[PDB]
């Protein structure tokens, strides 16, 4: 696995479903496919109204069965701890990896919470959080903000990439 989690905004924007959920038990691993699944109790949906209606529920999250291919291993003892999960729907099943944005709800900054609730959706049409995957991080588009932190980091925790007008975005810590 060569990946780390994205900026929360990119997570929001690329994910089909962003939910708040409880992990309700030990994983069920399948040797015939190399997916494991976790049973979850969905407490809140912040995005996915697009994909799901009123009576839709998500009971399982699928991930690779092993760490070498970015399989998610849930580290929590407490089954009442709520997690933010940002994932992809593949054939109507919710999938994550360790490259997904998955974290305890209460570990998130206030800005991140507002982000998932309210603000990150504002950046999805126009704006791109551009990682410094390369070494000389020069801006390639007026619609990009540069994400220069490794992790947890200031920019993940405090900032969104928001449009100020057509073809221009910028890091903001507010609104």
Swiss-Prot record:
Belongs to the protease inhibitor I35 (TIMP) family. Residues 1-124 form the NTR domain. Keywords: Disulfide bond, Glycoprotein, Growth factor, Metal-binding, Metalloenzyme inhibitor, Metalloprotease inhibitor, Phosphoprotein, Protease inhibitor, Secreted, Signal, Zinc. Detected in rheumatoid synovial fluid (at protein level). The activity of TIMP1 is dependent on the presence of disulfide bonds. N-glycosylated. Glycans are attached at residues 30, 78. This is Metalloproteinase inhibitor 1. Disulfide bonds join 1-70, 3-99, 13-124, 127-169, 132-137, 145-161. It is found in: Secreted. InterPro entries: Netrin_domain, TIMP, TIMP-like_OB-fold, TIMP_C, TIMP_CS.
């Amino acid at each position: 696995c060569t990946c780390v989690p994205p900026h929360p905004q990119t997570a929001f924007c690329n994910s089909d479903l962003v939910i708040r959920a409880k992990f309700v038990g030990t994983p069920e691993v399948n040797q015939t496919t190399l997916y494991q699944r976790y049973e979850i109790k969905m407490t809140k949906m912040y995005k996915g109204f697009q994909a799901l209606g009123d009576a839709a529920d998500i009971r399982f999250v699928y991930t690779p069965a092993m760490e070498s291919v970015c399989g998610y291993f849930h580290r929590s003892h407490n089954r009442s701890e709520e997690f933010l999960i940002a994932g992809k729907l593949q054939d109507g099943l919710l999938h994550i990896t360790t490259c997904s944005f998955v974290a305890p709800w209460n570990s998130l900054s206030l800005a991140q919470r507002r982000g998932f609730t309210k603000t990150y959706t504002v950046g999805c049409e126009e704006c791109t959080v551009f990682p410094c995957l390369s070494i000389p991080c020069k801006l390639q588009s007026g619609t990009h903000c540069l994400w220069t932190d490794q992790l947890k980091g200031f920019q993940s925790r405090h900032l969104a990439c928001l449009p100020r007008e057509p073809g221009l975005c910028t890091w903001q810590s507010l609104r």
